[PDB]
Structure formats: C-alpha cells, structure tokens
Amino acid sequence: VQLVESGGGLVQAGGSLRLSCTASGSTFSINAIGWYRQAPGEQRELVVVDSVKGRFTLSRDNAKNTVYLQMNSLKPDDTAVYYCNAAGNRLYPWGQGTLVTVSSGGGEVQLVESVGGLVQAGGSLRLSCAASGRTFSDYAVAWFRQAPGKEREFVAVITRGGGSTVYTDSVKGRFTISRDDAKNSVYLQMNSLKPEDTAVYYCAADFMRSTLSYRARAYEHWGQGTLVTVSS
C-alpha cells in the first residue's frame, strides 16, 4: 500500500480547502478510509464530518481510489498535519501527509495591506500598510506573520514619530520598517528573501503614550492579511 495525501496549504481563517488521498499499490486497499489530524506538538487523533463539526465533508471517487475532505469555515484550531488511513479494518502504512495551516490575525481604524508577491529567494519585496479611517501618525504599527506549520510571530514595529524600531532576531539584517506619515502609511522592506519568509503578513496598530510590546494581544487594530510566497 502506498497512501499519498495532497492539496493542503496556507490559507486564512474563514477559508476553505479540499484534501485528497489516493490509495494505491499491490494489495487490496479497501476504500472505507478516514482522516487523521496531528496538531504541531501533539500526537495524531482522528477527525473522521464526525468529530463535532458542521463544517467538514467526507466524500469519495471510487473510479480513482481517492478520498476527499472538504474543509469549510476553517479555524486556526484546524492547523495540523493531515493523514488518511483506515478508521472494521486497521493500520495501513502512513504516507508523508499534507500540511494545513489556518492563519489568523490578532484582536475604528481600517488597516489595508498592499498585495505582497511571489518572488524568488534572495529577492526583495516591499509591503505597505495604510489606515483608511484615521491619521496613522499617532499609532505604533507592527508587522506580524504566520508561516506554514508555525505559530504567528512578531516581525517588526515602529513607534509614533518613527524614532524607535525593533526587529525579531531572524530578520535583523534583512527587513526594514519605516513610515511616511504624509502618505498615511507604514512599509516593510524585505531583503534577502528566504523560504522561512513565506507566510501571511499582517499589519497591526495601537495607540501609545505605554511600553513598546511585541505580543499580538497588545494591538487593537489589524489588517486582513497579505500573502508572501518565496520560490526558488
């Protein structure tokens, strides 16, 4: 038996994914299969349209020996490595799995992020963020990001007046945060892009003067999210 799971990705909360599983090989591989979910830093558990969800749907295409999990109204809780196997029958050999990462911002002003991009490693890229409802001068503005199969992390922040900037260690040489209060925006210049930089980036703002915080929980205002993809 050669199980292969497919079709995972990095998506936003509220979004949707369809996972597929092709049972193959030189033995029977009966198609009464199910899905298993291993949350990062925990052991595999089972999920099946069964486990307390009006949101997932198990479905089949016998012609293909494929099983399908349609996932709607995704929550950050559904982040995990996803695997098909028996769930009667038992214990086929597990396949590599497929990774599912459901990104989410923390937490008036309406922050809007520029589009981001698909860019090759060691390239550059420039994110921009703009408050639409209000004067952004007054706000401390941070960037957070959420990469595949990781926790949401602090990237960078700039204070009102721009005289204080702080970067997470993994970025110190590469990204620069800055602002043009005249254009009502903040910018993240991203240099020497690397696989680790692929994530959903989030702009976030808070009114200060207070101590300069690096927790998402400290920031009332949050962009929708913008996707950065580094290839090579």
Residue numbers in the entry: 2 to 49, 60 to 98, 101 to 120, 128 to 229, 232 to 254
The authors write:
All four SCAs crystallized in a dimeric conformation where the two linked VHHs interact to form unique antiparallel VHH–VHH interfaces with their complementary determining regions (CDRs) pointing in opposing directions in all structures.
IL-18 SCAs DR3085 and DR3087 both adopt a conformation in which the two VHHs are in an antiparallel orientation with the C-terminal VHH shifted upwards relative to the N-terminal VHH. This offset places the interaction interface towards the VHH C-terminal side and increases the distance between the CDRs. The DR3087 VHH interface features a more diverse set of hydrophobic and predominantly hydrophilic and ionic residues that engage in an extensive hydrogen bond network and bury a total surface area of 950 Å2. While DR3087 had maximal activity with a linker length of 4 residues, DR3085 and DR3097 showed the strongest activity in vitro with a linker length of 10 residues, which was the linker length of the initial library screen.
